[PDB]
Amino acid sequence: KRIAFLFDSTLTAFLMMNLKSHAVTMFEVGKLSDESLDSFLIELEKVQRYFDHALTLRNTILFLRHNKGFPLDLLRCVLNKNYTLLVSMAPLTNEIRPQHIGPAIPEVSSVWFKLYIYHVTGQGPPSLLLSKGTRLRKLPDIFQSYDRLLITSWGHDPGVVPTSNVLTMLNDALTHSAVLIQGHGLHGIGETVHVPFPFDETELQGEFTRVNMGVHKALQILRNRVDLQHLCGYVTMLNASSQTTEADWVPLELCFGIPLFSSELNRKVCRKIAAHGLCRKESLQNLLHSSRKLSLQVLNFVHSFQEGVPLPAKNLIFKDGVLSEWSG
Amino acid sequence: FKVSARTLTGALNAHNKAAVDWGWQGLIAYGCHSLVVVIDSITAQTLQVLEKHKADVVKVKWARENYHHNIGSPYCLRLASADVNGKIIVWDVAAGVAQCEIQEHAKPIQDVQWLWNQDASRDLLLAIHPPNYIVLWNADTGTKLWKKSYADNILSFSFDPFDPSHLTLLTSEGIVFISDFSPSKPPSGPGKKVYISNDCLQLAYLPSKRNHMLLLYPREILILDLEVNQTVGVIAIERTGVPFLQVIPCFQRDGLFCLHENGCITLRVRRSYNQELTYDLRSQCDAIRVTKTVRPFSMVCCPVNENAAALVVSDGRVMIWELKSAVVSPLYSPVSFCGIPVGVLQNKLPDLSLDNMIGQSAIAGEEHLREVHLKFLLTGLLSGLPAPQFAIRMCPPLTTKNIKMYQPLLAVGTSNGSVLVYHLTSGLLHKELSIHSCEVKGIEWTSLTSFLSFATSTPNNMGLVRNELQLVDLPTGRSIAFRGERGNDESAIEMIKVSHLKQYLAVVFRDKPLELWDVRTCTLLREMSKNFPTITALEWSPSAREHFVFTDIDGQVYHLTVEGNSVKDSARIPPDMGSITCIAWKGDTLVLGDMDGNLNFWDLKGRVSRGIPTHRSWVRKIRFAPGKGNQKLIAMYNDGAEVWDTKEVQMVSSLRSGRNVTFRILDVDWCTSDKVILASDDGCIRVLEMSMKSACFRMDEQELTEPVWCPYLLVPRASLALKAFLLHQPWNGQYSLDISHVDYPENEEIKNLLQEQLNSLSNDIKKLLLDPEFTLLQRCLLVSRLYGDESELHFWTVAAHYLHSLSQ
């Protein structure tokens, strides 16, 4: 049968700016079958972020349709009748959340997963989670030395704002939803490098460099607790001291699926799928066991700091590698 | 859970444009509509509010401290304020009581300023009385010294920082110079007058250069030289720029703080490294949004360190900015730290004060070094109550079944669509949530952590109004619809009631039958038929069978009972005098309010009525006092509020607007069994006593979340002892900052006060104090800086500099 490529309105919005006229079927109907995909191939072939996104889909569609004579479906958000494999992309926007190569429960693709990674690793940027309606009267001392900060709203996408007047927007954005505060750089825009998984045997050795980041201690710990061997995606690392040692790099985010924003990272991920064998019949049975193993741990951890996704009720701060409750 | 009487401030008025001052004591005071608010900058929390003026406050000025401090003259807080009616009040901000009253004529006071020469007397005050009168006053006994009259219209005046006998005046014609100022005799003649060649904004002296002053213009800044009466420096903005609004000079270093019309603050420093004086911009902040209703009034700066600035805007928001240094004309680091040069291996605090950030003055073009860059950072933000027409409600009363988790929360509704949650114990705003898109009409609580609120939209040409109902849980902030999706074509909602046990709920429309809901289940129970009397007042019975009563447009009283889905009728009452608009029930007594201003005290024990006319205009709402056996009600009228007693009919206390109180009452409530909450029309909420008699709030008995470092709040015997302890740090070998190591036989309370005052110091100050290489002179300078005194601040710097110069 067919593979369903789950996505959101972000891809349609980016592809909207014959193809534009036919984009309403993608936007409204959202049920592009193979008999429509073969037609849309010519529209996707005739065609900077607009160019980057358009190029990524053509490579992705032309890779999930060969033998490894097997068609594909392009639904967007009785599923055991026409589909047997569920493949999503990363990142999944916080606005919208058989086998599934991606997040298992909605809490995985949420803010709650960022704190879980820091708790099980102990290395990460400073964080501050504030409940809805919380009023800030003084700027925290831990965020006073940074020049750029990352602001994440519950349900929205992260953004980068200056620290000169961050108090004005903090007291305004907290009135509508919870706001997560993280540091980005001590002198400006930080450095971000994405490391895809599953890791190869020729990459798990050597010395820590900018092109070989598989020897970091943070990723070593996450390998025995997350089971990153039967899933695809990338790992985000942040360097706030950029104007190399292993103490200047900390994990920032982990996303499951096939990336679609970049071109270099989209071609290494697809190569690993057809090389390690993440599509063979006797290679997803272990994913079923790991599907309910990660779900219970994340759900229990969320319920621990609590006495679609549940809204936060307490204030949590992450400093010195310890997660606790913010006194104020 | 004790609740203390306090008041909450909100927005500002147009008459409070120039009512703000930052004194040497470290506190910031600004004028409310008719109140004076004192706040801190380190912790950004309100400390004391003064309420005695009967008019708008126009001027607030802190006292000057340039004298030796001892037992006879201890450290105390003194404040002076002026009003529109022409009254000057000298304040002692430690208990809320005044010490001196000065009034002359019935015209607003235009300018108030203290005298910096306190060698002989420290209780001299000079004020301008319109139109051409200047009077020197005494702050101790309120006795006039002398009066001088001129033939012009005096706008503002300034004193010479170097010569106490020189004084200048700004008039509508020109500038008048006085060279014979003395507290013993009035000026001899009119003095020397010059004409500028009307639209001047400010006139002040320059404390960095002798015989120099500046004239403020919207597009230009002029520096004037006195002995030649010529302009020697011009500071002008570009062609496309924001006009100037205010300027504040500095004393430690040659610099000026400028405020623009868009809310931007810029710092300019005199050029000294590579013919007229040139000031180069160094730092700039971020502008704020400008609206026809929101605009900045004025700004103040710290007179001790000159490293912090505060901005006041019309909506009640206070912004505190800080200046930071990091490593056009270049600037270099100072050579001497805390009065003496230091090496390259000692701890340094460049951010302690402005003089520790940049070097001294120099002449450009001369043969002679670490670069210093300054930036502005926002670290403080204070907010007040929104626009008038509030909507307040109180938390369920404290019973014995919920003592463990009881919290005295207060919910206030505003026209923006937001709900404010207060604590009423510490006085801090707990939470602020955006709920509705229109004005909030009513707020009712369903539990200790949840409440309900409803709002209506703008009616159309037919009358149908969209109705909104949202249920909010405070810890999570979630808001969900109660009725659901009922569309935008329905009648409006007048009132909603929640029963005593938080079990059932009723919704009243203009022309729609009554509906009964369930709080826990959130499902409909029973809807009244069309043949149903119109609803004008409804009240439950605080006694799952629960009773509620209501009246109709005719006057008949209907009693109904509810039990699950079945609803039955209890009895009927013969009509009785006009139309009822409010019903209150408690115990066995029922009280009815009428349009004419009559209160019928029905009692369901003997079938007897007691109609006592109030001789007032109209009754709005009545509510009883929480607590078993507490038979007291508060009645709200169109002119004030009154407290009654249902056991013996006798008025206890009254508050009428125009005769007893100056403001109006928009809402009333019951805080506790002995206190009430009143909502004012100017944007203020006050918690008063049984008689609503204004009290004197004292800072001694006040709980604070964060300690505040202020030696002036301590007893006179404690501040000097703490200063002596801090000066001689090396006690008995080791270094420590706790009282319990040194012999000091005094009571425990003052010891604890000293300990908590010491524990509130900054980490860097404590680290500097715990330094074996921190010499005695640096310790004395740090103590002088911390205590805010000027005499030792001026003495010790010069003494240390000359001692170090002559020692080598």
Contact predicate B120/B138, CB 8 Å: no
DSSP B447: S
Backbone angles phi, psi at B501, to 5 degrees: -90, 10
B362, B541, B641, B666, B688 from B620: Cα distances, Å: 72, 20, 10, 10, 20
Long-range contacts of B137-142 (CB under 8 A, 24+ apart): B137/B88, B137/B102, B139/B78, B139/B80, B139/B90, B139/B100, B140/B100, B141/B100, B142/B90, B142/B100, B142/B101, B142/B102
Q: Could you give the CA distance from residue A126 to residue A150 in angstroms, rounded to a whole number?
A: 11
Do the bridges between strand A2-6 and strand A83-90 make them parallel or antiparallel, or are there none, so unpaired? parallel
Which residues does B426 contact at the CB level (< 8 Å), separation at least 6? B703, B704, B705
Closest CB to A135 among B43, B432, B478: B432
Residue with tokens 């001299």: B124
Residue A167: which of B378, B430, B478 has the nearest Cβ? B378
Q: Which two tokens stand for residue B426?
A: 């510490």
**Please, what is the angle between helix A112-121 and helix A285-304, to 10°?**
90
Are B83 and B109 a contacting pair, CB within 8 Å? Answer: yes
Examine residue A103 and say whether the peptide bond preceding it is cis (omega within 30 degrees of 0).
no
Q: Do A312 and A127 contact (CB within 8 A), yes or no?
A: no
3-state DSSP assignment of residue B601 = strand
Question: Which residues 270-289 of B have a C-beta within 8 angstroms of A?
Answer: 285-286, 288
What lies within 8 Å, CB to CB, of B669 at 6+ separation is B392, B393, B394, B623, B676, B677
The rounded distance, in Å, linking the Cα atoms of B344 and B496 is 72
HSE of B670, CA atoms in CB hemisphere, 13 A: 21
Q: Does A134 sit within 8 Å of B377, measured CB to CB?
A: no
User: Contacts of residue A302 in chain B, CB cutoff 8 Å?
Assistant: none
* DSSP-assigned states of every residue in A10-22: HHHHHHH--HHHH
In terms of residues, how long is chain B?
Answer: 808
Strand partners, B225: B212, B230
Q: Which residues of A touch B383 (CB under 8 A)?
A: 135, 171
Interface test with A, best of B412, B432, B470, B479 (most A CBs within 10 A): B432
Cβ burial, residue A205 (10 Å; 0-12/13-18/19+): exposed
- Chain CA centroid to CA B391, Å: 21
Q: How far is CA B564 from the centre of its chain?
A: 50
3-state secondary structure of B457: coil
Chain A residues in contact with B475 by the CB 8 A cut-off are 131, 313
Say whether the peptide bond before residue B711 is cis (omega within 30 degrees of 0): no
Cβ proximity of A101 and A276 under 8 Å: no
A175 touches chain B (CB under 8 A): yes
- Determine how many CB atoms are found less than 10 A away from the CB of residue B763: 8
Exposed/middle/buried for A243, CB within 10 Å: 0-12, 13-18, 19+? exposed
Contact status, residue B373 vs residue B329, Cβ threshold 8 Å: no
Structure tokens at B620: 């709005």
Q: By the 8 A CB rule, do B578 and B596 touch?
A: yes
Q: A26, A20, A66: which is closest to A43 by C-alpha? A: A20
Do the beta carbons of residue A95 and residue A155 sit within 8 Å? yes
DSSP assignment, residue A28?
Answer: I
Residue length of chain A: 328
- Specify the amino acid at residue B77: L
Q: How distant is the alpha carbon of residue B331 from its chain centre?
A: 38
Helices vs strands, H then E, count in chain B = 5, 58
Name the strands in the sheet holding B557-563, side by side, starting at the edge strand that comes first in the sequence: B537-540, B546-551, B557-563, B566-573
> Which of B377, B382, B430 is nearest residue A137 as measured by Cβ atoms?
B382
Q: Provide the shortest C-alpha distance from residue A187 to chain B (in Å).
A: 12
Chain A residue with the nearest C-alpha to that of B318: A137
Closest CA to B614 of B584, B635, B591: B635
Strand-pair category, A83-90 with A258-259: parallel
> What torsion do the CA atoms of B527, B529, B535, B538 make, to the nearest 10 degrees?
-40
Distance CA B97, CA B51 (A): 10
Measure CA B59 to chain center. Answer: 15
**C-alpha distances out from residue B163 to A27, B178, B180, B189, B458, Å:** 79, 12, 11, 19, 65
- State residue B716 phi and psi, 5-degree precision: -60, -35
Nearest CA in chain A to B420: A133
Nearest-CA neighbor of B126 among B152, B95, B147?
B147
Distance, in Å, from the CA atom of A17 to the CA atom of A13, rounded to the nearest integer, reads: 7
Q: Which residues contact A315 (CB under 8 A, 6 or more apart)?
A: A128, A129, A130, A131, A134, A325, A326, A328
Q: Which residues pair with B641 in a beta bridge?
A: B636, B655
Which pairs from B172-178 meet CB under 8 Å and 24+ separation? Answer: B172/B198, B175/B203, B176/B150, B176/B152
Q: What are phi and psi of B41, to 5 degrees?
A: -100, -30
Answer for the pair A154, A311: CB distance below 8 angstroms, yes or no.
yes
Q: With left for phi above 0 and alpha for psi between -120 and 50, is residue B558 left, alpha or beta?
A: beta
- Nearest Cα of chain B lies from the Cα of A17 at a distance, in angstroms, of 32
User: Could B381 and A144 be called an inter-chain contact, meaning their C-beta atoms sit closer than 8 Å?
Assistant: no
Q: Is A133 on the interface with B (CB under 8 A)?
A: yes
Nearest Cα residue to B57 out of B88, B23, B33: B33
Neighbouring-strand partners of residue B194: B175
User: Could you say which residues from 255 to 294 on chain A have a Cβ atom under 8 Å away from some Cβ of chain B?
Assistant: none
Q: Contact at 8 Å (CB) between A234 and A196? A: yes
Sheet containing strand B665-670, edge to edge, reads: B7-8, B685-688, B676-680, B665-670
Rounded to an integer, what distance in angstroms lies between the CA atom of residue A88 and that of residue A97?
12
Cβ atoms of residues B263 and B290 within 8 Å: yes
Amino acid symbol at B358 = I
Helix (H) or strand (E) run with residue B325 in it = strand B318-326
Q: Decide if B432 contacts A175 (C-beta within 8 A).
A: yes
The angle subtended at Cα B583 by Cα B581 and Cα B588, nearest 5°, is: 155
Chain A contact for B383 (CB, 8 A cutoff): yes
DSSP 3-state assignment of B45?
coil
CA pseudo-torsion sign B708, B709, B710, B715: positive
The C-alpha atoms of residue B10 and residue B8 are separated, in whole angstroms, by 7
Smallest CA–CA distance, residue A289 to chain B, in Å, is 34
> Tokens in use for A38?
């073969």
How far apart are the C-alpha atoms of A310 and A326, rounded to whole Å? 19
* Inter-axis angle of helices B716-727 and B776-787, nearest 10: 150
Q: Both ends of chain A: CA-CA distance in Å?
A: 56
* Residue (of B167, B164, B137, B163) closest to B150 by Cα position: B167
Structure token digits, residue B255: 């610099």
Who's near B576: CB < 8 A, 6+ residues apart? B555, B600, B609
Separation of alpha carbons B713 and B708, rounded Å: 10
Is B325 an 8 Å CB contact of chain A?
no
How far apart (Å, rounded) are the C-alpha atoms in residues A264 and A215? 21
**Token pair in block for residue B343:** 């090496």
Question: Which residues sit opposite B637 in a β-bridge?
Answer: B619
Beta strands in B659-779 (DSSP E): 665-670, 676-680, 685-688
Both structure tokens of B432: 């602020």
User: In this complex, is the C-beta atom of A141 within 8 Å of any C-beta atom belonging to chain B?
Assistant: no
Whether B301 contacts B322, CB under 8 Å: no
Can you spell out the DSSP letters for A101-163? ES-SSTTTTSTHHHHHHHHHH-----EEEE-TTB---B--GGGSS-SEEEEEETTS--EEEES
Q: How far is CA B355 from CA A191, A304, B305, B360, B553, in A?
A: 37, 51, 8, 8, 76
Place of tokens 């000359």: B802
- β-pairing, A322-325 with A316-319? antiparallel
Query: Up-side HSE of residue B663: CA atoms within 13 Å toward CB?
Result: 22
User: How far apart (Å, rounded) are the C-alpha atoms in residues B80 and B82?
Assistant: 7
